[PDB]
């Protein structure tokens, strides 16, 4: 019972439109599109990236630490004797 006639009541919200054939597929791309994608990415940055950077840090540190203990292990035999 949720057909389009059954949905929410709403009152005088007039809406305008155009035929797809009456308008080009890529309006104002260079002037309005790219800056929009840019503000989007700029909103996304600090909320997303830095924690991944922390992943890069823990990754490189873990690799350097394993590789360090492994190859300094004979070096640990060296300081041993």
């Amino acid at each position: 019972g949720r057909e389009f006639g059954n949905l929410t009541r709403m009152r005088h919200v007039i809406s305008y439109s155009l035929s797809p054939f009456e308008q080009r597929a890529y309006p104002h791309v260079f002037t309005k599109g790219i800056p929009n994608v840019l503000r989007r990415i700029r909103e996304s940055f600090f909320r997303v990236v830095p924690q991944f950077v922390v992943f890069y840090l823990i990754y490189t540190w873990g690799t350097e630490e394993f590789e360090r203990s492994k190859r300094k292990n004979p070096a640990a035999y060296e300081n041993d004797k």
């Binding site: 709403m10 005088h12 035929s19």
Partner: protein
């Protein structure tokens, strides 16, 4: 149309409608165009109707 006789209507028309200007003032001419037809739509609501 109806009971009017043509020549009476014409001879009478000459005495009153003849005062109407005929040569254009300022020589103005309307500029009609073969105007475009958009494929758009409008959709007003008011659900209480």
């Amino acid at each position: 149309a109806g009971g009017v006789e043509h020549q009476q209507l014409l001879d009478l028309a000459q005495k009153h409608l003849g005062g109407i200007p005929w040569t254009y003032a300022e020589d103005a001419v309307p500029t009609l165009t073969p105007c475009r037809f958009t494929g758009s739509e409008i959709r007003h609501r008011d659900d209480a109707l």
